[PDB]
């Protein structure tokens, strides 16, 4: 048999240069193992250098699109503005499944540009977003630091343009 517990990872967050704390996620390897693995590995950086030439890692990335009462979005480690990023499976990988629903705040979900274009970019919901069910693969949830999520969210605008720089200063897996 097999009974691997859910992986836990973390972001250390600064806002406007100030250390504000740690977000901790648990990843749904029991439901979406491929998607979960991609995010886990981009937290540790273990895959090394990507086809972009840049480290396959979330360290030093920003939350480049922040929309209050919706979500906060990050993970672009190749262009830092939402135009870049890559997965551990290549430039993109397919939607795994849509089993987990966007039915509560603090869910971790894949950003995409339509079907089967998952890369490295992710978002964290701050509300229920059920109109994203079937289009974005939910693969984890926040278990510590939802307040830091809200502090990031507070730097947002309707357009998603950030009013302050929110950075993942360090990241990794807790093993």
């Amino acid at each position: 048999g097999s009974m691997l517990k859910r992986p836990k990872t973390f972001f250390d967050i600064s806002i406007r240069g100030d250390k504000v704390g740690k977000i901790v996620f648990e990843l749904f390897n029991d439901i979406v193992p491929k998607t979960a693995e991609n995010f886990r590995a981009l937290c540790t950086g273990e895959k090394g250098i990507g086809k972009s030439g840049m480290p396959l890692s979330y360290k030093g990335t920003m939350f480049h699109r922040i929309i209050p009462q919706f979500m906060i979005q990050g993970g672009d480690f190749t262009r830092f503005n939402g135009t870049g990023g890559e997965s551990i499976y290549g430039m993109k990988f397919d939607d795994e499944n849509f089993k987990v629903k966007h039915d509560k705040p603090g869910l971790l979900s894949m950003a995409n540009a339509g079907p089967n274009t998952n890369g490295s970019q992710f978002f964290i919901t701050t509300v229920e977003t059920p109109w994203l069910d079937g289009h974005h693969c939910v693969f984890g949830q926040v278990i510590e630091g939802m307040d830091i999520v809200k502090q990031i969210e507070s730097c947002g605008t309707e357009s998603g343009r950030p009013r302050a720089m929110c950075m993942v200063t360090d990241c990794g897996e807790m093993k």
Partner: peptide
């Protein structure tokens, strides 16, 4: 524009 809408 990329990401959820």
């Amino acid at each position: 524009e990329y990401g959820p809408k």
